[PDB]
Amino acid sequence: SMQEEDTFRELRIFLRNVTHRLAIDKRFRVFTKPVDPDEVPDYVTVIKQPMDLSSVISKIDLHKYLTVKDYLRDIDLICSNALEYNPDRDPGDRLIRHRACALRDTAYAIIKEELDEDFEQLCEEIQESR
Ligand SMILES: O=c1cc(Br)ccn1CCO
Ligand SMILES: [Cl-]
């Protein structure tokens, strides 16, 4: 329906604003663009599902997220990809892990404070009805 289309539009506007706030944070610069396979050729061979905030914007705009839960799965991937690809004790890996975890924690905290649970529930019920 048109009302359901209006619901999903509001979801996209909400998710674009959360994603923009993550992207303008200087801590999260490394997560804003896909990993250039020059600097790191083995990335795309180790990480089967690369994810970055530019890919998340593209996905929002392609109407791939019908619920905040589906968006949070892609935020979770940014964090788990970094935990998997950068697991060493050395400071370069520890810094990327801490930034990735912080991204994830930030996205969850903004959604806890700003997502209405009844809005999420509506999205979930329209999705489950398709
Ligand atoms: O990129 C921008 C910049 C501003 Br300012 C606001 C929204 N967005 C969309 C998120 O990609
Ligand atoms: Cl840095």
16 CB near ligand 1 (under 6 Å) = yes
Name the CA dihedral angle for 45, 107, 59, 12, rounded to a multiple of 10 degrees.
180
Q: What's the rounded Cα separation, in Å, for the pair 15 and 34?
A: 19
Ligand 2 centroid, distance to 64 Cα (angstroms): 31
Radius of gyration of the chain (CA): 16
Is residue 120 within 8 Å of residue 68, measured between CB atoms? Answer: yes
Is residue 72 within 8 Å of residue 19, measured between CB atoms? Answer: no
Please state the separation of Cα 16 from the chain's center in Å. 10
9 CB near ligand 1 (under 6 Å) = no
Method: X-ray
Q: Which domain holds residue 117?
A: 1-130
Ligand 2 centroid, distance to 126 Cα (angstroms): 42
Number of domains into which the chain is organized: 1
CATH of the domain at 49: 1.20.920.10
* Count, residues in the chain: 130
Ligand 1 centroid, distance to 4 Cα (angstroms): 24
